[PDB]
Amino acid sequence: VSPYGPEARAELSSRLTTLRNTLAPATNDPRYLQACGGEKLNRFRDIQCRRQTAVRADLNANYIQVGNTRTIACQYPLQSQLESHFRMLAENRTPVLAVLASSSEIANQRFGMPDYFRQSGTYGSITVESKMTQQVGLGDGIMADMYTLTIREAGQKTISVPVVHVGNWPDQTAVSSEVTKALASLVDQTAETKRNMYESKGSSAVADDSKLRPVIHCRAGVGRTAQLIGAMCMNDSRNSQLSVEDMVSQMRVQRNGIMVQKDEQLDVLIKLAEGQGRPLLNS
């Protein structure tokens, strides 16, 4: 018996599959947040948002927790959702926003994915100012671009959020383990330098568990986002013993059944798992 063999992984896929089929949204499904007024909520009719963990009423976003690791996964905001997207960023006092949508995607107007973090802009009352800083090589040609978004709203405390942007991670693909672990750490490390900044400042958002969470998003927020979230979860010593099965089941139950979309992305979390002698299945 090898916990990571052909057999074992076959068992993992059965379970995980039944869960996706089971979590599929029905029409007006009560488990999922529904678009109000006819305004559009969902980037893709079928990538839905669990009502219970929903962050705001008008975004497709979710508070997620696997083990002891808390973050917020979302979809790329549609143009009309930006003033709320920034609001959530500000109120969460975001220690870091990781964006995994490639530059070709954002570039292509057909996709309607605004280039919101790479330049200055005014949305409603919220004015934003971007400023590029370092640029880090993660390996295998992958590269992260770093920015700093300053969010200003009249009458509100000005908040700046550090952005980490992996511009060349194609949609529907998995970056290797090594680039993945390399990315996860770069995200954790950025998170703490900023958490530490609010901490030495006495911000009460530190007490609060709905705040100071890493916001991550790609295109649909179930693919490239999941894989990263599964590797941040594994970087936490506290999340010990938590198998891949639970890991995948919590993301899926707290967002939708498409979390960890492709079988190759899942292979990556199975690789990291094997590398720590971490279990795949439960029991």
What is the rounded CA–CA span in Å between residue 142 and residue 153? Answer: 35
Residue with tokens 């409603």: 124
Provide the β-strand partners of residue 146.
Answer: 164
How many CB atoms within 10 Å of residue 72? 24
How many CB atoms within 10 Å of residue 221? 29
Residue with tokens 């901490």: 199
- Could you tell me which of 280, 167, 190 has the C-alpha nearest to residue 234? 280
> Technique behind this structure?
X-ray
- Could you tell me which of 140, 142, 144 has the C-alpha nearest to residue 132? 144
Query: Which stretches within the chain are classed as H helix?
Result: 6-23, 82-91, 103-107, 177-199, 224-233, 244-254, 263-275
Residue with tokens 């709320």: 84
What is the rounded CA–CA span in Å between residue 183 and residue 185? Answer: 5
* Category of 254 on φ-ψ map: left (φ > 0), alpha (ψ -120 to 50) or beta: alpha
What is the rounded CA–CA span in Å between residue 175 and residue 28? Answer: 35
What is the rounded CA–CA span in Å between residue 247 and residue 253? Answer: 10
What is the rounded CA–CA span in Å between residue 195 and residue 192? Answer: 5
φ and ψ at residue 266, rounded to 5 degrees: -65, -35
Resolution of the coordinates, Å: 2.4
3-state secondary structure of 66: strand
Catalytic site includes residue 233: no
- Could you tell me which of 156, 155, 162 has the C-alpha nearest to residue 197? 162
How many CB atoms within 10 Å of residue 173? 13
Read off the DSSP letter of residue 33.
-
Domain 1-283 is in which class? alpha beta
Regarding beta strands 69-74 and 61-66, do their DSSP bridges make them parallel or antiparallel, or are they unpaired?
A: antiparallel
Q: In sequence order, what are the residues at sequence separation of 6 or more whose Cβ sits closer than 8 angstroms to the Cβ of residue 83?
A: 123, 124, 125, 126
- Which of 36, 49, 74, 218 does the annotation list as catalytic? 218
What is the rounded CA–CA span in Å between residue 160 and residue 83? Answer: 15
Q: What is the DSSP annotation of 71-99?
A: EEEEPPPPGGGHHHHHHHHHHTT-S-EEE
What is the rounded CA–CA span in Å between residue 8 and residue 244? Answer: 12
Position 40: which residue type?
K
Position 191: which residue type?
A
Regarding beta strands 142-153 and 159-166, do their DSSP bridges make them parallel or antiparallel, or are they unpaired?
A: antiparallel
What is the rounded CA–CA span in Å between residue 166 and residue 270? Answer: 22
Position 62: which residue type?
N
What is the rounded CA–CA span in Å between residue 280 and residue 283? Answer: 10
How many CB atoms within 10 Å of residue 21? 8
Position 140: which residue type?
D
Regarding beta strands 215-217 and 142-153, do their DSSP bridges make them parallel or antiparallel, or are they unpaired?
A: unpaired
What is the rounded CA–CA span in Å between residue 276 and residue 28? Answer: 42
Position 8: which residue type?
A
